[PDB]
Design an enzyme around this catalytic site. Structure first.
Site, PDB file in Angstrom:
ATOM      1  N   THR A  84     -71.230 -36.436 -45.605  1.00 12.54           N
ATOM      2  CA  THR A  84     -69.954 -36.983 -46.040  1.00 12.54           C
ATOM      3  C   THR A  84     -69.194 -35.952 -46.847  1.00 12.54           C
ATOM      4  O   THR A  84     -68.182 -35.414 -46.403  1.00 12.54           O
ATOM      5  CB  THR A  84     -70.139 -38.247 -46.895  1.00 12.54           C
ATOM      6  N   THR A  85     -69.702 -35.670 -48.037  1.00 12.46           N
ATOM      7  CA  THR A  85     -68.997 -34.823 -48.986  1.00 12.46           C
ATOM      8  C   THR A  85     -69.259 -33.366 -48.646  1.00 12.46           C
ATOM      9  O   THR A  85     -70.383 -32.882 -48.785  1.00 12.46           O
ATOM     10  CB  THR A  85     -69.455 -35.138 -50.400  1.00 12.46           C
ATOM     11  N   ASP A  91     -73.684 -32.730 -48.087  1.00  9.33           N
ATOM     12  CA  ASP A  91     -74.789 -33.678 -48.083  1.00  9.33           C
ATOM     13  C   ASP A  91     -75.259 -33.859 -46.643  1.00  9.33           C
ATOM     14  O   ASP A  91     -74.817 -33.138 -45.748  1.00  9.33           O
ATOM     15  CB  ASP A  91     -74.347 -34.991 -48.714  1.00  9.33           C
ATOM     16  N   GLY A 122     -63.894 -32.488 -48.880  1.00  9.91           N
ATOM     17  CA  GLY A 122     -63.714 -33.191 -47.631  1.00  9.91           C
ATOM     18  C   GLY A 122     -64.690 -34.328 -47.463  1.00  9.91           C
ATOM     19  O   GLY A 122     -65.830 -34.253 -47.928  1.00  9.91           O
TER      20      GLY A 122
END
Lengths: 204, 220, 122, 228, 240, 191, 240, 232
Positions: F1-2, F17, F128
């Site tokens: 995700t991050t 991650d 992002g």
């Protein structure tokens, strides 16, 4: 539903060395029947039938298209058809309209062309083949015929008790059903001969 | 329907449960969802059955074509690329939950395929409706580079927990073993659920039904 | 398609294929026809059968509608195709305009079709 | 096949365009004459048989209510051009509520008088005589297969056109009248034809501003013939 | 003799005369040369007035395809115009699809393949042109390429296209090309054009000089030749 | 995700991650969110999975083809332009969180970002993914211009640590990447 | 045996021949170029000379060794346009392989595909059948180094001692006389035999500035182009 | 391309197709081959001489399977042979897509003969100068099918094609018979190959495919040098 627009029910049952298929006779629109002599079981070669249940439009349409491709195959190759080949052909023709689908559930009932091995299978409305050894059913009523055939079937059956089992199963399961009735046609075939009987069903 | 995969110290052990349901009714008690691809690669499916079957037969034909054009053993990543490119071409319309497994020159390689086309290289995956029970059994009892019977017992116990969960199968849980030289395939692995015999029975007689029109047609 | 002209003009201003292809008609079976004040009459000559065979399928006179009558000469297969085309055309005229097909309209169709058929590419 | 459809001359123009100009010559003659009172027009049918029914063979066709025509040589290509010209004038009516003028008619025809192409068929074999009554009075227009469109004051075409143009230049001036031009045309006609002049050889087609409709003369032409 | 008609046929010794006939077509055209220095490329064309009918500033064979690339064509002019338009089209594609300046190598490859496709088939003729391609980059320096009517494209320091193809590079090669800046090479090109064919077969010629490099900061344009007027005051000293 | 990409003097530093989720259930517990394209140029993706995979594969195709036809090392801005074109031209359907990074011989380390719209911009640092907002809250607090490599490693370590700690979808394991003039040095932090 | 139009297009002559493709086998011979490939052990060596009479012509842009992929090199003879076009087709089809199939293309499959494309240009008439010869090299896992040749007829083969161009009937006779002794090929044996076979065919014994040497080896399977210094080192190492 | 699309094959005044006849002559000028149907299997054998001693014999392979039980060789030109091979590969795989059962050899020859006949008739392309020898063990009985550049096909107990094919055919008609086994078929195939081949015949001069009822098998030069080590 759309399958329950005109009714319809097809039962097939595998015997010892023979195979029995039966279907209903009622035809009509949602609440109004029309006639008692609509054909849903079609001869595809010798000792080998097919049944279609659901919308009768796709019944007559797919019956003509399969007869088309079948006669093309038996004229391009002089032998007659094996049942797995027919099952793959039906799966292909139904899978061609992936998003424009026909509304039918075909049941193929046939013998071996070389030996006397019976064969039963059913397909879905997009072309999922499914082979068993006991029985396959289709149409509007399902759980009725499922309970009856799981109640009455034996593995090794002479054609007489095969006939009487499939007769009682169709009669009781159709009489419990509402939209499908008005007589039952029974095809019992074997290696030696083809027998077609009609039953005195409850006309209600 | 609960398929799962694992990679042991040499190859891949696959499992499945063969209840083909149509809606709310058990329609089949034995449906082979373990499909052929190649002498080294198989595939397992979930979700829409006919779409998975047509897709896996198409890719098997394509890989037979490409291998016989090549003249040697296929690679797993080629099947991975073909499947992901096809399923992304169909823009997520066709529902195909696929588990891909084979042993290449490089060794064992296991993939999960989601029907939009998203692919993952993982040592163990579960797909299907009751896949969470098998993922529970794996994440409980996985360790890297297991032995043969350890992995077979683990996958069998996983699908067994899935069948004691909802939407399992009546069947004798199907397994499959792929090694670098020895390919195996086992339909009647273990029957936990014996059919209880009727103490009946629901009998009839040859003439208890009225007949209206009989016909005779001889044959050859 | 074929980027070639069969219809190239002559050095003296003629067509090598049109008036010259009239000779194949001129080397064909004879057929005459007149109109009376009420009854029309026509027919073909030179059956030339093998005196022991069938001739009901070699008939050179047919109809397109119930009101118009056909005849030809030359080679037969072109007449067969033109007759089938004219059948479909007069039936399509019957589709739009609910008159009986006038003879002038269908002759304009046949003559214009044969004209543009000569006009086309190869 | 001796320098076909798409090759120039070392000295001049194309072969087949020259051959189209030569292929005009086999056709029957026709004479149109512009007069400010109106445009008259004549043609010779060249009838061979008594079976050859005279009123069926068309030379003067009717494009619009005020636009006539005359053809040359090849017939059915001319009929195709006539049909499509009527279509294009009808489009002009449909899109402007008025009459496509005759110069614009002939320009719409001569957009594809030379669009002959078998790749990326043949040039046409008809020279057309066009008459009409526009807002600028009567008009007389002559085109060619090569599309070189020009206005003609009184043009003669086809066979015997040399002596026809010569004997027409002997008789023409600017301030002529109608029936004088008619009888002067048919004198030249029975000078260039080979048969006796009678009712079934020729036909007249006359358009006037006050007599826009019926660009034709039917059986009074016999009276016109007997006045010579 | 019988095989030189089509552009698809080979000869019984194995070459295509259509390509050869296209090659020697440009030989009769005007003389066009080119040479680079250590921070730029200079073009040069001996261009002729017909007699008295021209305007000295029409129809320049010194093209300008990209911001830093232009052509120095010679041969049949309209075909060179069309091929330059194709080159503009390809540079537009590269700028639109990648957002930065086209390197001259890939551009020359695309143009060479385009010429190759027009030399392959029988429907079209091979091109009757021969041109130059010069440019400059801060990360690549000066590049000079060269394209025949067949389509073979590689790199030079100097070239000459026209009549005096050998007779220009006879003394182009004795120029100290590395250690000179292109401002010297201006009057160098002036003297090389001026030596060949002063008055012998024709009456008059006229000089244009295209010019790209570090001194123009990567821009490509014709010199202000009138500015510093380098030919004539040297040409009158290069006759003796 | 991050996902996160940070440049410095020598090269750039990437990071993500793993935890590819669907609904509330995690499908995959460990995932290569960053993907090699060229041997010096990486990208890290977010949004949908298969869509960005297909985009990265097609960019790999065109970029490797272009780099071989140049017979030269390619630029990072070139691949950024390719992602911009393939994102924007048929956008309408896709959910791309593409961040382009990589060392370049002509231009050092560069970091470009392509969000879901299809625009392109060069930055010195990038976030992002859905769980990027928090460490985006303090990446403009903790950053200082002119870091070293190990400072960037610790910087992204603390960033992805708090992102994995706080966000529900984020978590899992830490993947890092060091790209410079020298080599590609990838490592995985955990625990 | 000219019957009809066999001298012009791709039809069948009497007795079994067709003249166009066997006209194209000497289309290599107007290149004026010689190439030798060597596979004796787990390395693979290409050698090919240049012919540059000019000082104004460059040297980096003249090399025929064309790196198709990172692990696939090749060499060209014949005319340059067909060679480079075949090269871009090979690069494009290799990229198609890598995208569709997920891994690096084998050098055998690529030569098969180029042979198929050569048949495509051979089958339909009115198409010029690309008179260039391509020799490929590559390393395979579980098979080692490989050498393949593409014919203009699309008739591929693959074999150890390989040479095509102008003078290679004699070179293959020397390679029959040379690869019959069963010694090992310890990579300087390969380089030395390539240099000495080319230096016995042409018999020039020249500088390291004329030949280009392409190598690939199973110690670094990347394709590799040699430098002037180590080329000179090999040449003086074979100088006794 | 332009797509001119007219065929170069027109009839003679005699009624012959001289391009097809020249293609047949080009076939007869090709490499020899032999194929024999035995009672249990079918044996194909080619004759593979390299031009020089430099050539390798693990790259190009004459005997080529089309499915797991269908063998196929030729007598003609490889660059056409591989094209028609790949076409037949895709064709048979499409048949298996439709019917989910291995294609019979009659259906292969029907479809391939239709494709090749289409290439005889279509515009401006030459026919393929390749004569095929197709075989397979389908439903117990094996088969043997020979085709030609004219698009026709036949069925043989045994045949031969290439150089001196009439000589090999006269030897096969005498030596062979209806009933043998696979190994004796291999033996008489090597005999009729050695009648017309060169003097130096080794494990690499020939390359032999068989067709068991268990499936196609392509032999190795290991078992060839086991068998052809002075076979009689």
């Amino acid at each position: 539903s759309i399958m329950s627009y005109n009714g319809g029910a097809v039962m097939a049952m595998k015997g010892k060395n023979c195979v029995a298929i039966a279907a209903d006779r009622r035809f009509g629109i949602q609440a109004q029947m029309v006639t008692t002599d609509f054909q849903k079981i079609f001869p595809m070669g010798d000792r080998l039938y097919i049944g279609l249940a659901g919308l009768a439009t796709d019944v007559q349409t797919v019956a003509q298209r399969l007869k088309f491709r079948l006669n093309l195959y038996e004229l391009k190759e002089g032998r007659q058809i094996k049942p797995y080949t027919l099952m793959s052909m039906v799966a292909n023709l139904l899978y061609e309209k992936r998003f424009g689908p026909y509304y039918t559930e075909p049941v193929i009932a046939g013998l071996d062309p070389k030996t006397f091995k019976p064969f039963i299978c059913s397909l879905d409305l997009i072309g999922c083949p499914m082979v068993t050894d006991d029985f396959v059913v289709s149409g509007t009523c399902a759980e009725q015929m499922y309970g009856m055939c799981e109640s009455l079937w034996e593995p090794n059956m002479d054609p007489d008790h095969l006939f009487e089992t499939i007769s009682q199963a169709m009669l009781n399961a159709v009489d419990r059903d509402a939209v499908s009735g008005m007589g039952v046609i029974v095809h019992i075939i074997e290696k030696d001969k083809i027998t077609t009987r009609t039953l005195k069903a409850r006309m209600d | 329907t609960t398929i799962a995969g694992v990679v042991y110290k040499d190859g891949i052990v696959l499992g499945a449960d063969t209840r083909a349901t149509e809606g709310m009714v058990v329609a089949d008690k034995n449906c082979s969802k373990i499909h052929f691809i190649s002498p080294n690669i198989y595939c397992c499916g979930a979700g829409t059955a006919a779409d998975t079957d047509m897709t896996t037969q198409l890719i098997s034909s394509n890989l037979e074509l490409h291998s016989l054009s090549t003249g040697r053993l296929p690679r797993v990543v080629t099947a991975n690329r073909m499947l992901k490119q096809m399923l992304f071409r169909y823009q997520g319309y066709i529902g195909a939950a696929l588990v891909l497994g084979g042993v290449d020159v490089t060794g064992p390689h296991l993939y999960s395929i989601y029907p939009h086309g998203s692919t993952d290289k993982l040592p163990y995956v579960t797909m299907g409706s009751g896949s969470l029970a098998a993922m529970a059994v794996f994440e409980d009892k996985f360790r890297p580079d297991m032995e043969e019977e350890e992995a077979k017992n683990l996958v069998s116990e996983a699908i067994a927990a899935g069948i004691f969960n909802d939407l399992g199968s009546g069947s004798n849980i199907d397994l499959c073993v792929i090694s670098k030289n020895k390919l195996d395939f086992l339909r009647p692995y273990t029957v936990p659920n014996k059919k209880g015999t009727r103490l009946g029975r629901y009998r009839c007689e040859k003439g208890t039904t009225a007949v209206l029109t009989e016909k005779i047609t001889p044959l050859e | 398609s074929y980027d070639r002209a069969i219809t190239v003009f002559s050095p003296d201003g003629h067509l090598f294929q049109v008036e010259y292809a009239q000779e194949a008609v001129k080397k064909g079976s004879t057929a005459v026809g007149v109109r009376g004040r009420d009854i029309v009459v026509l027919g073909v000559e030179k059956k030339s059968v093998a005196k022991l065979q069938d001739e009901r399928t070699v008939r050179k006179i047919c109809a397109l509608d119930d009101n118009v009558c056909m005849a030809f000469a030359g080679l037969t297969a072109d007449a067969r195709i033109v007759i089938n085309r004219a059948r479909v055309e007069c039936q399509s005229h019957r589709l739009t305009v609910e008159d009986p097909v006038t003879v002038e309209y269908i002759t304009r169709y046949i003559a214009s079709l044969k004209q543009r058929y000569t006009q086309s590419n190869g | 096949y001796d320098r076909g459809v798409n090759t120039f001359s070392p000295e001049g123009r194309l072969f087949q365009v020259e051959y189209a100009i030569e292929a005009i010559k086999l056709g029957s003659t026709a004479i149109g004459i512009q007069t400010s009172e109106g445009v008259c027009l004549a043609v010779e049918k060249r009838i061979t048989s008594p079976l050859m029914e005279p009123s069926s063979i068309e030379k003067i066709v009717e494009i619009d209510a005020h636009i006539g025509c005359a053809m040359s040589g090849l017939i059915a290509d001319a009929k195709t051009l006539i049909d499509k010209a009527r279509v294009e004038t009808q489009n002009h009516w449909f899109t402007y509520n008025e009459t496509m003028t005759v110069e614009s008619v002939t320009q719409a025809v001569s957009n594809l008088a030379l669009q002959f192409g078998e790749e990326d068929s043949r040039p046409f074999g008809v020279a057309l005589l066009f008459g009409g009554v526009d807002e600028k009075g009567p008009q007389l227009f002559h085109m060619d297969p090569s599309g070189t469109f020009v206005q003609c004051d009184a043009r003669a075409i086809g066979s015997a056109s040399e002596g026809a143009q010569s004997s027409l230049q002997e008789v023409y001036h600017k301030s002529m009248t109608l029936k004088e031009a008619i009888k002067s045309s048919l004198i030249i006609l029975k000078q260039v034809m080979e048969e006796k002049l009678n009712a079934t050889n020729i036909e007249l087609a006359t358009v006037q501003p006050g007599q826009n409709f019926h660009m034709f003369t039917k059986e009074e032409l016999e009276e016109v013939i007997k006045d010579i | 003799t019988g095989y030189d008609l089509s552009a698809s046929t080979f000869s019984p010794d194995g070459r295509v005369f259509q390509v050869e006939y296209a090659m020697k077509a440009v030989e009769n055209s005007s003389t066009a040369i080119g040479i680079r220095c250590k921070d730029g490329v200079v073009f040069g064309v001996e261009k002729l007035v017909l007699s008295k009918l021209y305007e000295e500033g029409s129809n320049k064979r010194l093209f300008n395809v990209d911001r830093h690339v232009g052509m120095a064509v010679a041969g049949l002019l309209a075909d060179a115009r069309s091929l330059a338009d194709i080159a503009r089209e390809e540079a537009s594609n590269f700028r639109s699809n990648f957002g930065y300046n086209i390197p001259l190598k890939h551009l020359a490859d695309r143009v060479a393949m385009y010429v190759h496709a027009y030399t392959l088939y029988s429907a079209v003729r091979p091109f009757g042109c021969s041109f130059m391609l010069g440019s400059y980059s801060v990360n690549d320096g000066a590049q000079l390429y060269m394209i025949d009517p067949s389509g073979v494209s590689y790199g030079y320091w100097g070239c000459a296209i026209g009549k005096a193809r050998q007779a220009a590079k006879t003394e182009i090669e004795k120029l100290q090309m590395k250690e000179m800046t292109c401002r010297d090479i201006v009057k160098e090109v002036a003297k090389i054009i001026y030596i060949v064919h002063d008055e012998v077969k024709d009456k008059a010629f006229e000089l244009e000089l295209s010019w790209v490099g570090e001194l123009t900061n990567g821009r490509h344009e014709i010199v202000p030749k009138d500015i510093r007027e380098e030919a004539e005051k040297y040409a009158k000293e290069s006759l003796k | 995700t991050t996902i996160m990409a940070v440049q410095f003097d020598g090269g750039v530093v990437l990071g993500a991650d793993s935890r590819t989720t669907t609904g509330s259930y995690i499908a995959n517990r460990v995932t290569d969110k960053l993907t090699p394209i060229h041997d010096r140029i990486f990208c890290c993706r977010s949004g949908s999975a298969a869509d960005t995979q297909a985009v990265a594969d097609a960019v790999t195709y065109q970029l490797g083809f272009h780099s071989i036809e140049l017979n030269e090392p390619p630029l990072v801005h070139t691949a950024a332009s390719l992602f911009k074109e393939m994102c924007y031209r048929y956008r309408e359907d896709l959910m791309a969180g593409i961040i382009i990074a990589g060392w370049d011989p002509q231009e050092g380390g560069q970091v470009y970002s392509v969000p879901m719209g299809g625009m392109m911009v060069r930055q010195s640092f990038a976030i992002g993914g859905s769980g990027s907002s928090y460490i985006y809250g303090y990446v403009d607090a903790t950053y200082r211009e002119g870091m070293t490599k190990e400072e960037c490693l610790q910087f992204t370590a603390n960033a992805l640590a708090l992102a994995m700690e706080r966000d529900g979808s984020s978590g899992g394991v830490i993947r890092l990447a060091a790209i410079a003039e020298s080599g590609v040095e990838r490592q995985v932090l955990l625990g | 045996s000219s019957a009809g139009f066999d001298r012009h297009i791709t039809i069948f002559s009497p007795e079994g021949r067709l003249y166009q493709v066997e006209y194209a086998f000497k289309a290599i011979n107007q290149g004026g170029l010689t190439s030798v490939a060597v596979r004796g052990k787990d390395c693979a060596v290409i050698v090919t000379q240049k012919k540059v009479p000019d000082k104004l012509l460059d040297s980096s842009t003249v090399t025929h060794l064309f790196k198709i992929t990172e692990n696939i090199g090749c060499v060209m003879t014949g005319m340059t346009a067909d060679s480079r076009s075949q090269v871009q087709r090979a690069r494009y089809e290799a990229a198609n392989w890598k995208y569709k199939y997920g891994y690096e293309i084998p050098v055998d499959m690529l030569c098969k595909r180029i042979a198929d494309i050569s048949q495509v240009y051979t089958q339909n008439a009115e198409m010029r059948p690309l008179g260039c010869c391509m020799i490929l090299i590559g390393i395979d896992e579980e098979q080692g180094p490989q050498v393949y040749k593409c014919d203009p007829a699309g008739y591929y083969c693959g074999f150890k001692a390989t040479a095509a161009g102008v003078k290679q009937t004699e070179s293959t006779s020397f390679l029959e006389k040379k690869v019959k002794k069963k010694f090992d090929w310890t990579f300087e044996q390969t380089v030395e035999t390539a240099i000495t076979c080319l230096s016995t065919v042409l018999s020039i014994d020249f500088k390291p500035s004329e030949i280009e040497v392409g190598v690939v080896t199973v110690e670094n399977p990347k394709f590799r182009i040699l430098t002037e210094a180590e080329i000179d080192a090999h040449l003086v190492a074979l100088a006794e | 391309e332009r797509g001119y699309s007219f065929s170069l094959t027109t009839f003679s005044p005699s009624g012959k197709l001289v391009q097809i006849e020249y293609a047949l002559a080009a076939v007869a000028g090709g490499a020899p081959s032999v194929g024999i149907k035995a009672a249990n299997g079918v044996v194909l054998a080619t004759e593979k001489k390299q031009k020089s001693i430099l050539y390798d014999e693990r790259s190009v392979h004459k005997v080529e399977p089309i499915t797991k039980h269908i063998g196929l060789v030729y007598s003609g030109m490889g660059p056409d042979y591989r094209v028609l091979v790949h076409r037949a590969r895709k064709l048979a795989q499409q048949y298996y897509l439709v019917y989910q059962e291995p294609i019979p050899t009659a259906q292969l020859v029907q479809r391939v003969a239709s494709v090749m006949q289409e290439y005889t008739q279509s515009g401006g392309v030459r026919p393929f100068g390749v004569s095929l020898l197709i075989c397979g063990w389908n439903e117990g009985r094996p088969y043997l099918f020979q085709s030609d550049p004219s698009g026709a096909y036949f069925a043989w107990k045994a045949t031969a094609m290439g150089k001196n094919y009439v000589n090999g055919k006269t030897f096969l008609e005498k030596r062979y018979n209806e009933d043998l086994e696979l190994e004796d078929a291999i033996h008489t195939a090597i005999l009729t190959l050695k009648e017309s081949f060169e003097g130096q015949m080794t494990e690499d001069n020939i390359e032999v495919g068989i067709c068991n009822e268990a499936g196609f098998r392509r032999l190795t030069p290991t078992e060839v040098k086991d068998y052809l080590a002075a076979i009689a």
